[PDB]
Every structure is written in C-alpha cells, then in structure tokens.
Amino acid sequence: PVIKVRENEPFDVALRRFKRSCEKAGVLAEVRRREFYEKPTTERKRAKASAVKRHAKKLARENARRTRLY
Amino acid sequence: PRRRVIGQRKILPDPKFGSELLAKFVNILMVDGKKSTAESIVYSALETLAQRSGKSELEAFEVALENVRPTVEVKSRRVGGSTYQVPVEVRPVRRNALAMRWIVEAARKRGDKSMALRLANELSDAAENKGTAVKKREDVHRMAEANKAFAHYR
Amino acid sequence: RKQVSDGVAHIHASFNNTIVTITDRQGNALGWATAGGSGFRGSRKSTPFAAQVAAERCADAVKEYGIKNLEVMVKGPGPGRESTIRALNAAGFRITNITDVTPIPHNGCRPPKKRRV
RNA sequence: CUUGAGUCUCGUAGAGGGGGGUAGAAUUCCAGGUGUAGCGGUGAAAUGCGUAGAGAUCUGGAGGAAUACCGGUGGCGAAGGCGGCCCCCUGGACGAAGACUGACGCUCAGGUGCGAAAGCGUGGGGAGCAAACAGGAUUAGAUACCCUGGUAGUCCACGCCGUAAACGAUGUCGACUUGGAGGUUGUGCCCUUGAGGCGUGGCUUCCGGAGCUAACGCGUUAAGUCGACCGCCUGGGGAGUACGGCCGCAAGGUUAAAACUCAAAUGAAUUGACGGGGGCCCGCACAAGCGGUGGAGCAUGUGGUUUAAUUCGAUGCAACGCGA
Ligand SMILES: [Mg+2]
Ligand SMILES: [Mg+2]
Ligand SMILES: [Mg+2]
Ligand SMILES: [Mg+2]
Ligand SMILES: [Mg+2]
Ligand SMILES: [Mg+2]
Ligand SMILES: [Mg+2]
Ligand SMILES: [Mg+2]
Ligand SMILES: [Mg+2]
Ligand SMILES: [Mg+2]
Ligand SMILES: [Mg+2]
Ligand SMILES: [Mg+2]
Ligand SMILES: [Mg+2]
Ligand SMILES: [Mg+2]
Ligand SMILES: [Mg+2]
Ligand SMILES: [Mg+2]
Ligand SMILES: [Mg+2]
Ligand SMILES: [Mg+2]
Ligand SMILES: [Mg+2]
Ligand SMILES: [Mg+2]
Ligand SMILES: [Mg+2]
Ligand SMILES: [Mg+2]
Ligand SMILES: [Mg+2]
C-alpha cells in the first residue's frame, strides 16, 4: 500500500488514502490469518461454513423477506 | 436507573446571599436533616473566610471551589473481563458537587475545634492550594494521568 | 552533529509493542523509541497512546539531526499503525510518502500452533 | 442382428500421475554498517534474549520447507489424494460426426493391487513447526490449558506398515418417474447486431413435488419404483477382547469366541429446566450517593452447654424482637 502525498494534499487526507489503500490490499487480514497455523481440515470446514451461511442468508433475505412484516 | 431520565430537583437559594451553589453546599454539609445548624455553620465559616482572605463570602468560596474541582475522574470499564480504569471528563454540575463533597469531608477530618473553624480553615487552605481537599483532587488527577492510555478506548 | 533534512520513519507495530526508528534515507538509524521505554508496560504499552508518546520521544531524539522531510514505512499489525504517524506529523515533519511494508509470505514457513484460550 | 459393451478419426478442459529444472516473498542463521536500552511475552507476570551492544534498520551470503493474490460449495482422480512457473514421460474423462466388431456384458467369495496421518528400517537433509523433555506462570494440585525453549518427527531416496469420523456415516451396474435456480466444461443453429436468442451432451450445488421414512429428512447425483450380484446385522456389556491361525522388524493388523452379567442399551422428535450460548428487557440488581451492621455496653431471640425442669413449636433466603 504505497502512497505519495501530492502537492497541496492535507495530511489527514493523505492518512485517509493510506488507510483505504491498506484495507483494499487486505494486509491486516492476511497477517491475522497467518498468525497461527490453521489446519487444512479447519480451513476447509471454515470455508464450507462461510459458503453455507452466505447462501442461506442471501436466500432468506431475497425470497423469505418478501412478505408484510407489519 | 434503567428507564429514567428523571427531572433534576428544585433547590432553593440560601436566604443570606441568594446563591444556589451555596444552598447546595449547605445541604451537603447538613447532617440528620438539621438544616438550621448547617446554615449557621456555613455562614460563620463564610464570614470568617471573608474577613481573613478578602473580597466577599461568595468570591472567596468560588476561589476555593476553583482550586478543588476536578477536570477528570476515572471509572472502571469492565468489558474484557478485566477492569480498565478509564479517565473521563467530569461535567460541570458534578465538578461542583464533588468539590463541595471533598471540602466538607476534609473539614470534618480537620483537627480544629468548632466545625465552623474547621470549615473556614479548610476553605482558606483550598484557596491557597495547600490543603487536603486539594490533595485529594491532585490524587484523582494523578490517577487519570496514569490511566491516560485507556482514555478513548472504553 | 550531522544534518540530513530527510529521513525514513520505520514504525514496527506488533501487537505487544511499537518501535519507532528514524533513519537516514540509506538505512542508518538516527534515533529510536518504544512504548516500553516510553514508560508503559503490558496493557498500557499495547495501546495507541503509548505508540504516540513513543513517536514523540523519537522525534525529540532526532531533533539534533534537523530532519524536515520524512517518509514513513509502517510494518506489522498494531494498535498504533496510525497513532505514531499522527504524532510524528504533529511533532512537525512533512510526511511525504506513507508505505506499508508488512512482510507477507507466499505460503512459506509454518506458523506456530493455535492458542487454546 | 445392433440398441448393451468396445475400437478408430478429430478436438476439448483439467492442482490426474512420474521425473528434472527454475522463480519470488517470507522465517532462521552467519558477516558487516547505523545505532542505544531495552526486546520478547501475557489476563498480569516470569523464564528467555540484550550494554560481551540486543530489538529496530540497510547490505551481502548460506540453507531448508512451502507456494500469497488467482482460488471458487471451481476442477481432476477408483478411493487415498492433487495447488508457483517451465520442460520430458504418461493415464483417464467428455463432445462431434461418421466407420467398424457383433453380447465380446454386470457383479464377484477366495486372490491381487492401490491406500491420509502417525509409526518402523537404512542412508541423507533439517530453515520453520513441534510429541517427548526442561524451565516460568496459573492452581488446592496442574505430570494440562498459557509463556520461553526444544529432540524424534514433519522433508528426500528406497523398503515396510495397512489403519482413520478412510464419511455422502449412503456397496457396484442398469432401467423408469413432475419441477425451479445456479456453477463448470463441450457442441449445433441464430446476423455474436453486444457481453447476447433457441437447442443438445458430461460432471456438479442448492431448493422442492409425488413417493418413501420412526422421524429427521431423501427427493432424476433418491433414502422414490424395479432387476442382478456381492458385503454385513440380529439386545446392552464381556469384546473386536482371549486362545489358535496368517501377516508384520516392531508397533501391531486381520480372522474371531465362551463363561458370566443386566432388563434394558439405543434412534428421532416433543414439553420443560439448565448453559462459564445469543438477542431484547426489567428490578436499590449494580453504578452514583447517604446512613448503618460486623468492634463496645446493654435489650431481645436463637444455637449450644447446664439443669430436677430449663415447656413445645419456627430453624437457607422465606427460623433467629418468630407463635409470644
Ligand atoms: Mg505465540
Ligand atoms: Mg493437468
Ligand atoms: Mg472426470
Ligand atoms: Mg475380497
Ligand atoms: Mg509419512
Ligand atoms: Mg524415518
Ligand atoms: Mg534417518
Ligand atoms: Mg517452537
Ligand atoms: Mg509449547
Ligand atoms: Mg475400519
Ligand atoms: Mg477423507
Ligand atoms: Mg464405515
Ligand atoms: Mg468391481
Ligand atoms: Mg431437497
Ligand atoms: Mg448377553
Ligand atoms: Mg485383536
Ligand atoms: Mg490373533
Ligand atoms: Mg453501591
Ligand atoms: Mg455489636
Ligand atoms: Mg460478639
Ligand atoms: Mg442462631
Ligand atoms: Mg425454644
Ligand atoms: Mg424443631
């Protein structure tokens, strides 16, 4: 996440760009995940859970949440 | 409480000087619902203080308060299972109340004979900034400074 | 004794501690400071505020060198990662470039085992 | 005879397998520069490392292992499994049109092969991690969880072992039976007018009808309707154990009982209760405050002890100035 502060760019603005760049890159997330060894089985299981939850939630929202709530 | 933003209660101003702050001080001082006695003590203390230090009763009293109010106190935020002492800025009504409370406690402690005498001495000390209530405020501030790392991560 | 005007601020921001190190543009270190040496231990040195005061201390230390421009290289996942740069700017350098240099492996060495807490 | 089964032609996608090179990032170590008192770690510490100059930072070098992003309920494989890039050898699947053989097929007890990880033998290698082990914490203890270290092992070659919740807890092969939304990979036509319209194959994910099921659920990839063959079960424990056999260097694997003992053991779902589950909410529940009790004397009640009797009852909150 390289940033160079442009001419007449405020510092706060520069900081904002830097943070955005880092978030987009996903550096913190990568480091956190690589902090400890996740077993392959654990990684697979987590992936499966994420996929299932995401799919179920999407289905519930779009199709199940098409009714009169009140 | 959980579900209450109750209205602050009405305190009448003291008859001699017409001051709400002074009335509150008298109330704090009072014990056993004996208001008359408390007001007599407060007036005696004020009169002596005015004579000793200067200008008026209310101005002297204010000066003492200024030297004994705390800007910041600490609370114990208990979120991560352990308790973080966090600093927090003390709002004005609390600042006055806390300062008054500290002053009265210090006066009660003090070794002079009459209550009025103790109060006058304590107030004068506060004005100078070498007394015990002032020491208490200093201690509170010291703690806040120590725990400044936990100020805006509650 | 020397002057350089333009330095690099290497902000090593681990979870436990923040190390700030001002260096010449080549790599040679001028002054450093940590939250530990800044007077914070444990829960207090693993905070943004500690990082900020460490940064202030570092700036003071390299004041002799008269450094005016400064590019900051942030490393690691840390409570500061921002406080340090804010503090440095306040201390009054022109921040020219801000770069992240956190070392990610391309699936290399095995990490240590997961903590059971 | 050609519909099952196979052969040939042309393409397609693929972490399918075996061998050999190579790339960059990162960790470790080594040497050197800068530089100075800390670093590391945790809930908090300490062990550990550092003024014999560490950690930080730049340069160079060594070496091992693994391939970020792409990456996907994506793909390939009989399963186990397979993930940087390049080459060499190599197996299968699928589609298109035809041509060919002419039931050549399905299943399979014994048998044979393949078979994660750990483990074993011999010879290498060894960065990181890490059983064992050591020290520091925590604790009533802590032969654990946490921390700092750390050896087999993890890697390579070649042998062995032969097991896993080796799971879809679902044997293989074939036929038939309403649908919807996707993914992936072919292919025919439509002007691809654009990413696009209508088909037709393969594999694949979810939802759901009839039907089935104890229910949960399954539902054209069946747990539906059927046919062929195999494997396996017959209450819980004893016990996948003993003995015998076979196999193995060993660890052990495989085959596999009996006495004795009980009237249960189990599956799914229901209503509660409970959770050091989750969401929302209240109450002097905490918080903010004020005043007490626990120390003293005395009053009173209780326990106890004493007594001839110390009447009987109340005795966690919700008995103890209570019946009185
Ligand atoms: Mg660790
Ligand atoms: Mg391939
Ligand atoms: Mg295939
Ligand atoms: Mg057999
Ligand atoms: Mg192995
Ligand atoms: Mg070996
Ligand atoms: Mg060996
Ligand atoms: Mg280790
Ligand atoms: Mg360990
Ligand atoms: Mg088995
Ligand atoms: Mg498996
Ligand atoms: Mg089985
Ligand atoms: Mg077969
Ligand atoms: Mg279904
Ligand atoms: Mg029996
Ligand atoms: Mg046996
Ligand atoms: Mg045997
Ligand atoms: Mg309270
Ligand atoms: Mg008492
Ligand atoms: Mg007593
Ligand atoms: Mg009692
Ligand atoms: Mg009685
Ligand atoms: Mg009784």
Side-chain angles (χ1 to χ4, degrees), chain A residues 1-6 11-12 14-15 18-19 22 27-28 30-37 39, chain C residues 15 74 77 81-82 85-86 89 95-100 102 104-105 107 110-115:
Chain A
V2 179
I3 123 212
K4 307 194 176 65
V5 178
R6 291 183 262 274
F11 163 65
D12 9 331
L15 214 71
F18 169 65
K19 274 192 290 195
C22 276
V27 274
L28 276 26
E30 199 87 291
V31 168
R32 294 158 44 185
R33 105 163 167 75
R34 301 174 170 285
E35 193 177 352
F36 305 111
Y37 179 81
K39 263 177 68 187
Chain C
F15 287 113
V74 184
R81 200 170 188 82
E82 193 193 317
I85 319 169
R86 280 185 189 283
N89 178 252
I95 302 302
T96 95
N97 153 269
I98 309 169
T99 47
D100 184 345
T102 306
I104 71 305
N107 269 40
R110 195 191 169 105
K113 70 187 173 169
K114 188 168 171 61
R115 300 177 72 227

Short mmCIF file of all heavy atoms in Angstrom, two decimals, chain A residues 1-6 11-12 14-15 18-19 22 27-28 30-37 39, chain C residues 15 74 77 81-82 85-86 89 95-100 102 104-105 107 110-115:
data_model
loop_
_atom_site.label_atom_id
_atom_site.label_comp_id
_atom_site.label_asym_id
_atom_site.label_seq_id
_atom_site.Cartn_x
_atom_site.Cartn_y
_atom_site.Cartn_z
N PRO A 1 0.81 -1.22 0.00
CA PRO A 1 0.00 0.00 0.00
C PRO A 1 0.84 1.27 0.00
O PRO A 1 0.89 1.98 1.00
CB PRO A 1 -0.79 -0.13 1.29
CG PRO A 1 -1.03 -1.60 1.41
CD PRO A 1 0.15 -2.30 0.75
N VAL A 2 1.51 1.53 -1.12
CA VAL A 2 2.32 2.72 -1.27
C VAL A 2 1.44 3.92 -1.58
O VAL A 2 0.53 3.84 -2.41
CB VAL A 2 3.37 2.51 -2.38
CG1 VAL A 2 4.21 3.76 -2.58
CG2 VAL A 2 4.23 1.31 -2.07
N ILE A 3 1.70 5.03 -0.90
CA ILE A 3 1.06 6.31 -1.18
C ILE A 3 2.14 7.38 -1.15
O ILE A 3 3.07 7.32 -0.33
CB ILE A 3 -0.11 6.63 -0.22
CG1 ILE A 3 0.10 7.97 0.49
CG2 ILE A 3 -0.34 5.50 0.77
CD1 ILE A 3 -0.48 8.01 1.88
N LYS A 4 2.01 8.38 -2.02
CA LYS A 4 2.89 9.55 -2.05
C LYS A 4 2.00 10.77 -1.94
O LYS A 4 1.05 10.92 -2.70
CB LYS A 4 3.71 9.61 -3.33
CG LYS A 4 4.50 8.36 -3.65
CD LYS A 4 5.54 8.63 -4.73
CE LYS A 4 6.40 7.41 -4.99
NZ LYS A 4 5.60 6.29 -5.56
N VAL A 5 2.31 11.66 -1.00
CA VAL A 5 1.43 12.79 -0.74
C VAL A 5 1.62 13.81 -1.86
O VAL A 5 2.73 14.29 -2.09
CB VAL A 5 1.71 13.41 0.63
CG1 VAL A 5 0.82 14.61 0.86
CG2 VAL A 5 1.52 12.38 1.73
N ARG A 6 0.53 14.12 -2.55
CA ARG A 6 0.56 15.03 -3.68
C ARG A 6 0.70 16.47 -3.21
O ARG A 6 0.54 16.80 -2.03
CB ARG A 6 -0.66 14.85 -4.57
CG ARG A 6 -0.68 13.54 -5.34
CD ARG A 6 -1.89 13.45 -6.26
NE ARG A 6 -2.99 12.68 -5.70
CZ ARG A 6 -3.10 11.36 -5.81
NH1 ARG A 6 -2.18 10.66 -6.45
NH2 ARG A 6 -4.15 10.75 -5.27
N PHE A 11 -2.57 16.45 5.33
CA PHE A 11 -2.01 15.26 5.95
C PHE A 11 -3.13 14.29 6.28
O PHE A 11 -2.99 13.08 6.10
CB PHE A 11 -1.22 15.61 7.20
CG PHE A 11 -0.96 14.44 8.08
CD1 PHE A 11 -0.17 13.40 7.64
CD2 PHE A 11 -1.54 14.35 9.33
CE1 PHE A 11 0.06 12.30 8.44
CE2 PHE A 11 -1.32 13.25 10.13
CZ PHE A 11 -0.51 12.23 9.68
N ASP A 12 -4.22 14.80 6.86
CA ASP A 12 -5.34 13.94 7.21
C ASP A 12 -5.82 13.21 5.97
O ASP A 12 -6.15 12.01 6.01
CB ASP A 12 -6.46 14.79 7.82
CG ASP A 12 -6.20 16.28 7.68
OD1 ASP A 12 -5.02 16.67 7.65
OD2 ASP A 12 -7.17 17.05 7.60
N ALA A 14 -4.07 12.52 3.31
CA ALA A 14 -3.06 11.51 2.98
C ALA A 14 -3.27 10.26 3.82
O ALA A 14 -3.18 9.13 3.31
CB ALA A 14 -1.66 12.08 3.20
N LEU A 15 -3.49 10.45 5.11
CA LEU A 15 -3.74 9.34 6.02
C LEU A 15 -4.94 8.53 5.55
O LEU A 15 -4.94 7.30 5.58
CB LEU A 15 -3.98 9.86 7.43
CG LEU A 15 -3.49 9.04 8.62
CD1 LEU A 15 -1.98 9.06 8.72
CD2 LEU A 15 -4.12 9.58 9.89
N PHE A 18 -4.01 6.40 2.67
CA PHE A 18 -3.19 5.28 3.12
C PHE A 18 -4.03 4.18 3.75
O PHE A 18 -3.86 3.00 3.44
CB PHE A 18 -2.14 5.77 4.11
CG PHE A 18 -1.43 4.67 4.82
CD1 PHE A 18 -0.62 3.79 4.13
CD2 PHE A 18 -1.56 4.52 6.19
CE1 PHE A 18 0.04 2.78 4.79
CE2 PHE A 18 -0.91 3.51 6.85
CZ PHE A 18 -0.10 2.64 6.15
N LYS A 19 -4.93 4.55 4.67
CA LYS A 19 -5.79 3.56 5.30
C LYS A 19 -6.63 2.83 4.27
O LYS A 19 -6.77 1.60 4.32
CB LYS A 19 -6.64 4.20 6.39
CG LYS A 19 -5.89 4.25 7.71
CD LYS A 19 -6.75 4.59 8.92
CE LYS A 19 -7.22 6.03 8.89
NZ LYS A 19 -7.73 6.46 10.22
N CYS A 22 -4.48 0.35 2.36
CA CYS A 22 -4.20 -0.83 3.17
C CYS A 22 -5.42 -1.75 3.24
O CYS A 22 -5.29 -2.97 3.08
CB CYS A 22 -3.76 -0.42 4.57
SG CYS A 22 -2.01 -0.03 4.68
N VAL A 27 -3.98 -6.23 4.04
CA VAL A 27 -2.73 -6.64 4.67
C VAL A 27 -2.98 -7.13 6.08
O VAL A 27 -2.49 -8.19 6.49
CB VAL A 27 -1.72 -5.47 4.66
CG1 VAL A 27 -0.95 -5.44 3.35
CG2 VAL A 27 -2.44 -4.15 4.89
N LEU A 28 -3.74 -6.35 6.85
CA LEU A 28 -4.05 -6.72 8.22
C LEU A 28 -4.75 -8.07 8.28
O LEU A 28 -4.41 -8.92 9.10
CB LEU A 28 -4.91 -5.64 8.86
CG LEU A 28 -4.21 -4.42 9.47
CD1 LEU A 28 -2.85 -4.13 8.84
CD2 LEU A 28 -5.11 -3.20 9.37
N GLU A 30 -4.64 -10.52 6.09
CA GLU A 30 -3.68 -11.56 5.75
C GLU A 30 -2.78 -11.90 6.93
O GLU A 30 -2.58 -13.07 7.26
CB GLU A 30 -2.83 -11.11 4.56
CG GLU A 30 -2.11 -12.22 3.83
CD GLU A 30 -2.95 -12.87 2.75
OE1 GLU A 30 -3.93 -13.56 3.09
OE2 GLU A 30 -2.62 -12.71 1.56
N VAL A 31 -2.23 -10.88 7.58
CA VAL A 31 -1.35 -11.11 8.73
C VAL A 31 -2.09 -11.85 9.83
O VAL A 31 -1.58 -12.83 10.40
CB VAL A 31 -0.78 -9.78 9.23
CG1 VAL A 31 -0.13 -9.98 10.56
CG2 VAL A 31 0.20 -9.25 8.24
N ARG A 32 -3.29 -11.39 10.17
CA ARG A 32 -4.06 -12.04 11.22
C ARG A 32 -4.30 -13.51 10.90
O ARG A 32 -4.15 -14.38 11.77
CB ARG A 32 -5.37 -11.29 11.44
CG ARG A 32 -5.14 -9.91 11.99
CD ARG A 32 -6.32 -9.02 11.71
NE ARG A 32 -7.58 -9.70 11.98
CZ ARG A 32 -8.77 -9.17 11.74
NH1 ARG A 32 -8.86 -7.95 11.24
NH2 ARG A 32 -9.87 -9.86 12.01
N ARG A 33 -4.70 -13.80 9.67
CA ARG A 33 -4.93 -15.19 9.29
C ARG A 33 -3.64 -16.00 9.39
O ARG A 33 -3.66 -17.15 9.85
CB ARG A 33 -5.56 -15.26 7.90
CG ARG A 33 -4.65 -15.69 6.77
CD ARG A 33 -5.45 -16.13 5.56
NE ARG A 33 -4.63 -16.25 4.36
CZ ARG A 33 -3.78 -17.25 4.14
NH1 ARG A 33 -3.63 -18.21 5.03
NH2 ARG A 33 -3.09 -17.28 3.01
N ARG A 34 -2.51 -15.42 8.98
CA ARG A 34 -1.23 -16.13 9.00
C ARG A 34 -0.55 -16.09 10.35
O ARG A 34 0.62 -16.46 10.44
CB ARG A 34 -0.27 -15.54 7.98
CG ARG A 34 -0.72 -15.54 6.54
CD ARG A 34 0.30 -14.80 5.71
NE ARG A 34 0.07 -14.93 4.28
CZ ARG A 34 0.35 -16.03 3.58
NH1 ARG A 34 0.84 -17.10 4.18
NH2 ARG A 34 0.12 -16.06 2.28
N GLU A 35 -1.22 -15.60 11.40
CA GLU A 35 -0.60 -15.56 12.72
C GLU A 35 -0.38 -16.96 13.28
O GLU A 35 0.67 -17.24 13.87
CB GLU A 35 -1.44 -14.74 13.69
CG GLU A 35 -0.67 -14.42 14.94
CD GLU A 35 -1.43 -13.55 15.89
OE1 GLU A 35 -2.51 -13.07 15.52
OE2 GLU A 35 -0.92 -13.34 17.02
N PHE A 36 -1.34 -17.85 13.09
CA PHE A 36 -1.26 -19.22 13.58
C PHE A 36 -1.61 -20.17 12.45
O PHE A 36 -2.28 -19.81 11.49
CB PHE A 36 -2.21 -19.47 14.75
CG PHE A 36 -2.04 -18.52 15.90
CD1 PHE A 36 -3.02 -17.59 16.19
CD2 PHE A 36 -0.91 -18.56 16.69
CE1 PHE A 36 -2.87 -16.72 17.24
CE2 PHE A 36 -0.77 -17.69 17.74
CZ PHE A 36 -1.75 -16.76 18.01
N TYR A 37 -1.11 -21.40 12.57
CA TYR A 37 -1.35 -22.39 11.54
C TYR A 37 -2.77 -22.92 11.66
O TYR A 37 -3.11 -23.58 12.65
CB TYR A 37 -0.35 -23.53 11.62
CG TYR A 37 -0.57 -24.60 10.59
CD1 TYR A 37 -0.12 -24.43 9.29
CD2 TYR A 37 -1.22 -25.77 10.90
CE1 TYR A 37 -0.31 -25.41 8.35
CE2 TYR A 37 -1.42 -26.75 9.97
CZ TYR A 37 -0.96 -26.56 8.69
OH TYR A 37 -1.16 -27.54 7.76
N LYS A 39 -5.20 -25.65 10.49
CA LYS A 39 -5.14 -26.96 9.88
C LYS A 39 -5.91 -26.98 8.57
O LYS A 39 -6.84 -26.20 8.39
CB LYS A 39 -5.71 -28.01 10.82
CG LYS A 39 -4.69 -28.74 11.63
CD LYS A 39 -5.38 -29.70 12.58
CE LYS A 39 -6.06 -30.81 11.84
NZ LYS A 39 -6.87 -31.64 12.76
N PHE C 15 1.67 -6.47 17.94
CA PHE C 15 0.54 -6.42 18.86
C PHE C 15 0.98 -5.99 20.25
O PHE C 15 0.27 -5.22 20.91
CB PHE C 15 -0.15 -7.78 18.92
CG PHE C 15 -0.96 -8.09 17.70
CD1 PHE C 15 -0.59 -9.12 16.85
CD2 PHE C 15 -2.09 -7.36 17.40
CE1 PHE C 15 -1.33 -9.40 15.73
CE2 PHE C 15 -2.83 -7.63 16.28
CZ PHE C 15 -2.45 -8.66 15.45
N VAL C 74 5.36 1.72 7.47
CA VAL C 74 4.64 1.06 8.55
C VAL C 74 4.73 -0.44 8.36
O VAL C 74 4.53 -0.95 7.25
CB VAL C 74 3.17 1.52 8.59
CG1 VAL C 74 2.48 0.90 9.78
CG2 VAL C 74 3.08 3.01 8.66
N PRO C 77 0.85 -5.61 12.14
CA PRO C 77 -0.48 -5.28 12.66
C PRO C 77 -0.36 -4.73 14.06
O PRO C 77 0.14 -5.42 14.96
CB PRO C 77 -1.20 -6.63 12.63
CG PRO C 77 -0.12 -7.59 12.95
CD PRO C 77 1.17 -7.02 12.38
N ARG C 81 0.10 1.87 14.32
CA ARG C 81 -0.09 1.95 12.87
C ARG C 81 -0.71 3.23 12.33
O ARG C 81 -0.62 3.51 11.13
CB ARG C 81 -0.95 0.76 12.42
CG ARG C 81 -0.84 0.45 10.96
CD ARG C 81 -1.50 -0.84 10.58
NE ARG C 81 -1.19 -1.18 9.20
CZ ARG C 81 -0.08 -1.77 8.80
NH1 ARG C 81 0.84 -2.12 9.68
NH2 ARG C 81 0.11 -2.02 7.52
N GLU C 82 -1.32 4.02 13.18
CA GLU C 82 -1.88 5.34 12.89
C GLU C 82 -1.43 6.38 13.90
O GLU C 82 -1.07 7.49 13.51
CB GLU C 82 -3.41 5.25 12.90
CG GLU C 82 -4.11 6.46 12.32
CD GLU C 82 -5.59 6.47 12.64
OE1 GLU C 82 -6.22 5.40 12.53
OE2 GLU C 82 -6.12 7.54 13.00
N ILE C 85 2.06 7.81 13.25
CA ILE C 85 2.16 8.75 12.14
C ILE C 85 1.51 10.07 12.49
O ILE C 85 2.04 11.15 12.17
CB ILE C 85 1.53 8.14 10.88
CG1 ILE C 85 1.89 6.67 10.75
CG2 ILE C 85 1.99 8.89 9.65
CD1 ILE C 85 1.11 5.96 9.69
N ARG C 86 0.36 10.03 13.15
CA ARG C 86 -0.29 11.26 13.59
C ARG C 86 0.62 12.05 14.52
O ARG C 86 0.79 13.27 14.36
CB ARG C 86 -1.60 10.92 14.29
CG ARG C 86 -2.76 10.64 13.36
CD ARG C 86 -4.03 10.45 14.16
NE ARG C 86 -5.15 9.97 13.35
CZ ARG C 86 -5.86 10.75 12.54
NH1 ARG C 86 -5.57 12.03 12.42
NH2 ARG C 86 -6.86 10.24 11.84
N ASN C 89 3.55 13.63 12.62
CA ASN C 89 3.11 14.82 11.90
C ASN C 89 2.94 15.99 12.86
O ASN C 89 3.38 17.11 12.58
CB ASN C 89 1.81 14.54 11.16
CG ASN C 89 1.27 15.75 10.45
OD1 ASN C 89 0.27 16.34 10.86
ND2 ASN C 89 1.93 16.15 9.37
N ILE C 95 5.25 14.85 6.12
CA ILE C 95 5.13 13.46 5.72
C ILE C 95 4.97 13.40 4.21
O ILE C 95 3.97 13.87 3.66
CB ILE C 95 3.95 12.78 6.43
CG1 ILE C 95 4.15 12.88 7.94
CG2 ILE C 95 3.82 11.34 6.01
CD1 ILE C 95 5.43 12.26 8.41
N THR C 96 5.95 12.81 3.53
CA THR C 96 6.00 12.84 2.07
C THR C 96 5.34 11.60 1.47
O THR C 96 4.41 11.71 0.66
CB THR C 96 7.44 12.97 1.58
OG1 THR C 96 7.97 11.67 1.30
CG2 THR C 96 8.30 13.64 2.63
N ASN C 97 5.83 10.41 1.83
CA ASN C 97 5.25 9.15 1.41
C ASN C 97 4.94 8.29 2.64
O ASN C 97 5.69 8.30 3.61
CB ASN C 97 6.21 8.43 0.47
CG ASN C 97 6.04 6.94 0.49
OD1 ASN C 97 6.70 6.24 1.27
ND2 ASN C 97 5.17 6.43 -0.37
N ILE C 98 3.81 7.58 2.59
CA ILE C 98 3.45 6.57 3.60
C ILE C 98 3.33 5.20 2.94
O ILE C 98 2.44 4.99 2.11
CB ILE C 98 2.13 6.92 4.29
CG1 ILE C 98 2.16 8.36 4.80
CG2 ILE C 98 1.88 5.97 5.43
CD1 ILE C 98 0.81 8.85 5.26
N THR C 99 4.20 4.27 3.31
CA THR C 99 4.25 2.95 2.68
C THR C 99 4.08 1.85 3.70
O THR C 99 4.61 1.93 4.82
CB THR C 99 5.55 2.70 1.93
OG1 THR C 99 6.66 3.07 2.77
CG2 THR C 99 5.60 3.47 0.65
N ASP C 100 3.33 0.82 3.33
CA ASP C 100 3.16 -0.38 4.13
C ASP C 100 4.14 -1.43 3.64
O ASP C 100 4.19 -1.73 2.45
CB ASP C 100 1.73 -0.91 4.04
CG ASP C 100 1.49 -2.11 4.94
OD1 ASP C 100 2.45 -2.72 5.43
OD2 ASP C 100 0.31 -2.44 5.17
N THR C 102 4.53 -4.51 5.51
CA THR C 102 4.29 -5.70 6.31
C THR C 102 4.70 -6.96 5.54
O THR C 102 4.20 -7.19 4.43
CB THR C 102 2.82 -5.77 6.72
OG1 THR C 102 2.46 -4.56 7.37
CG2 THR C 102 2.61 -6.91 7.68
N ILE C 104 4.43 -10.27 4.19
CA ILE C 104 3.56 -11.43 3.99
C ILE C 104 4.36 -12.50 3.24
O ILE C 104 5.00 -12.20 2.23
CB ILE C 104 2.24 -11.08 3.28
CG1 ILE C 104 2.40 -10.72 1.80
CG2 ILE C 104 1.53 -9.97 4.03
CD1 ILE C 104 3.37 -9.60 1.45
N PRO C 105 4.39 -13.73 3.72
CA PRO C 105 4.99 -14.81 2.95
C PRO C 105 4.06 -15.28 1.84
O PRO C 105 2.85 -15.08 1.88
CB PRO C 105 5.20 -15.90 3.99
CG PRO C 105 4.12 -15.69 4.94
CD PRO C 105 3.86 -14.22 5.00
N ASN C 107 3.03 -18.29 1.12
CA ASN C 107 2.98 -19.61 1.71
C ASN C 107 4.37 -20.19 1.93
O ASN C 107 4.85 -20.99 1.13
CB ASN C 107 2.14 -20.56 0.87
CG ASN C 107 0.69 -20.56 1.30
OD1 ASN C 107 0.13 -19.51 1.62
ND2 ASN C 107 0.07 -21.73 1.31
N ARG C 110 5.90 -22.53 8.27
CA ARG C 110 4.72 -22.87 9.04
C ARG C 110 4.61 -21.97 10.26
O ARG C 110 5.60 -21.79 10.98
CB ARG C 110 4.80 -24.32 9.47
CG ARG C 110 3.52 -24.91 9.97
CD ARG C 110 3.81 -26.23 10.59
NE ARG C 110 2.68 -26.77 11.33
CZ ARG C 110 1.92 -27.77 10.91
NH1 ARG C 110 2.19 -28.36 9.76
NH2 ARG C 110 0.92 -28.19 11.65
N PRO C 111 3.46 -21.38 10.53
CA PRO C 111 3.29 -20.58 11.74
C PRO C 111 3.26 -21.45 12.98
O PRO C 111 3.08 -22.67 12.88
CB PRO C 111 1.94 -19.87 11.52
CG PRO C 111 1.55 -20.17 10.13
CD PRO C 111 2.24 -21.39 9.71
N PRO C 112 3.38 -20.87 14.17
CA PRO C 112 3.23 -21.65 15.39
C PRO C 112 1.79 -22.07 15.60
O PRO C 112 0.87 -21.59 14.95
CB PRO C 112 3.73 -20.70 16.47
CG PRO C 112 3.35 -19.40 15.98
CD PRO C 112 3.63 -19.46 14.49
N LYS C 113 1.60 -23.01 16.53
CA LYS C 113 0.29 -23.62 16.65
C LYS C 113 -0.70 -22.66 17.30
O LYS C 113 -0.32 -21.71 17.98
CB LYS C 113 0.35 -24.91 17.46
CG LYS C 113 0.62 -24.71 18.93
CD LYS C 113 0.83 -26.04 19.62
CE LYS C 113 1.26 -25.84 21.05
NZ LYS C 113 1.22 -27.12 21.78
N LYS C 114 -1.98 -22.94 17.10
CA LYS C 114 -3.05 -22.10 17.59
C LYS C 114 -3.18 -22.16 19.11
O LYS C 114 -3.07 -23.22 19.72
CB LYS C 114 -4.37 -22.50 16.95
CG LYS C 114 -5.49 -21.55 17.27
CD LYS C 114 -6.69 -21.80 16.42
CE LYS C 114 -7.87 -20.98 16.92
NZ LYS C 114 -7.60 -19.53 16.88
N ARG C 115 -3.41 -21.00 19.72
CA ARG C 115 -3.56 -20.93 21.16
C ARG C 115 -4.94 -21.40 21.55
O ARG C 115 -5.93 -21.10 20.87
CB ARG C 115 -3.35 -19.50 21.65
CG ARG C 115 -2.00 -18.92 21.32
CD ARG C 115 -1.89 -17.49 21.77
NE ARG C 115 -1.81 -17.38 23.22
CZ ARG C 115 -2.54 -16.53 23.94
NH1 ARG C 115 -3.40 -15.74 23.34
NH2 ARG C 115 -2.41 -16.49 25.25
#
